[PDB]
Write an enzyme that holds these catalytic residues in place. Structure first.
Site, mmCIF file in Angstrom:
data_model
loop_
_atom_site.group_PDB
_atom_site.id
_atom_site.type_symbol
_atom_site.label_atom_id
_atom_site.label_comp_id
_atom_site.label_asym_id
_atom_site.label_seq_id
_atom_site.Cartn_x
_atom_site.Cartn_y
_atom_site.Cartn_z
ATOM 1 N N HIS B 39 -4.729 93.468 -9.985
ATOM 2 C CA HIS B 39 -3.579 92.853 -10.636
ATOM 3 C C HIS B 39 -3.520 91.347 -10.415
ATOM 4 C CE1 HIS B 39 -1.232 91.966 -7.018
ATOM 5 N NE2 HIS B 39 -1.676 93.113 -6.534
ATOM 6 N N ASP B 61 -5.174 99.551 -10.479
ATOM 7 C CA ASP B 61 -5.416 98.157 -10.092
ATOM 8 C C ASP B 61 -6.309 98.040 -8.859
ATOM 9 O OD1 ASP B 61 -3.080 99.171 -8.732
ATOM 10 O OD2 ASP B 61 -2.000 97.304 -8.870
ATOM 11 N N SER B 113 -1.122 90.384 -0.250
ATOM 12 C CA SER B 113 -1.816 91.644 -0.469
ATOM 13 C C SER B 113 -3.246 91.571 0.073
ATOM 14 C CB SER B 113 -1.829 92.000 -1.956
ATOM 15 O OG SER B 113 -0.526 92.313 -2.417
#
Lengths: 52, 161
Positions: B39, B61, B113
Site C-alpha cells: 500500500h 497488500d 509500518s
C-alpha cells in the site's frame, strides 16, 4: 466484419479473464514463507509453475 | 540474552525505503523471499533489490519476490505457533488476547509500518501494519499463516501506520 469483431473480442476477453483467474489461483501461494506448490491440490490445473 | 537475540537478528534483515529521506516501509528477509506492505510506495536502498522484478497483491497488500543466492545467511525459521504470550517487537512487548494483537498506546506512531513480529524463540511470526486506539490499548493489523494461505485480521476501525 461484425461477426469477426465479436469473436475476436470474445476470445480476447476470455483470455484476459483466464489470466485474472490464473493470478487469483495461487497469488497467495506465491506468498507465504517457504512452502511449495500444493501439487495434491493443483499440479497444472491452472498453470501454477515457474521453473522450480 | 533475552532480547539481545532480537536486536542481533534485527540487523542485516530490515532494509530502508524512503521517497525523499522519509522512511515509510521496511523490507524483511525470510522464506527465500522478501515481503513489504504494497500500500506504500518507495524505492529500496540496496541496488540489487531494485533491478529484480517483483509481484503485487490487490487486497492483501503484500509482495513476494525471489532473492538470489548471495544473501542466504539472513533467513529466519518461519514456523507458525499460536500461543497466548508475548512477541516483543522492536519497540516494547506485545500483548495478545482473543485472537488479537494489542499494543500499549503511545508505543507506536503513523509512518512506522514494515516492522516484523517474531516469537521469542527467534522465529518470525507476522508483519505489522497498524492499528487504532480504543482506551488504554491499541489494536494491530498483521497477517498470519498456517504453513500457507496468508490471511489478514483487521478489526473494525483499524488504521495502518
Amino acid at each position: 466484419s461484425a461477426a469477426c469483431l465479436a469473436v475476436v473480442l470474445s476470445l480476447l476477453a476470455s483470455c484476459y479473464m483466464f489470466a485474472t483467474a490464473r493470478r487469483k489461483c495461487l497469488t497467495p501461494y506465491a506468498l507465504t514463507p517457504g512452502a511449495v506448490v500444493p501439487v495434491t491440490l493443483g499440479v497444472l490445473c491452472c498453470a501454477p509453475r515457474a521453473h522450480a | 540474552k533475552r532480547e539481545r537475540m532480537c536486536m542481533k537478528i534485527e540487523n542485516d534483515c530490515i532494509f530502508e525505503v524512503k521517497l525523499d529521506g522519509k522512511v515509510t516501509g521496511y523490507a524483511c528477509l525470510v522464506g527465500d523471499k522478501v515481503m513489504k506492505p504494497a500500500h506504500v510506495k518507495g524505492v529500496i536502498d540496496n541496488p540489487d533489490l531494485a533491478k529484480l522484478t517483483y509481484k503485487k497483491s490487490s487486497k492483501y497488500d503484500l509482495e513476494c519476490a525471489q532473492i538470489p543466492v548471495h544473501m542466504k545467511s539472513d533467513a529466519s525459521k518461519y514456523t507458525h505457533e499460536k500461543p497466548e504470550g508475548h512477541y516483543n517487537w522492536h519497540h516494547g512487548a506485545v500483548q495478545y488476547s482473543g485472537g488479537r494483537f494489542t499494543i500499549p498506546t503511545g508505543a507506536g506512531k503513523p509512518g512506522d509500518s514494515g516492522r516484523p513480529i517474531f516469537d521469542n524463540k527467534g522465529r518470525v511470526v507476522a508483519i505489522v501494519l497498524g492499528g487504532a486506539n480504543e482506551g488504554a490499548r491499541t489494536a494491530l493489523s498483521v497477517v498470519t499463516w498456517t504453513k500457507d494461505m496468508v490471511t489478514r485480521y483487521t478489526p473494525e476501525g483499524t488504521e495502518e501506520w
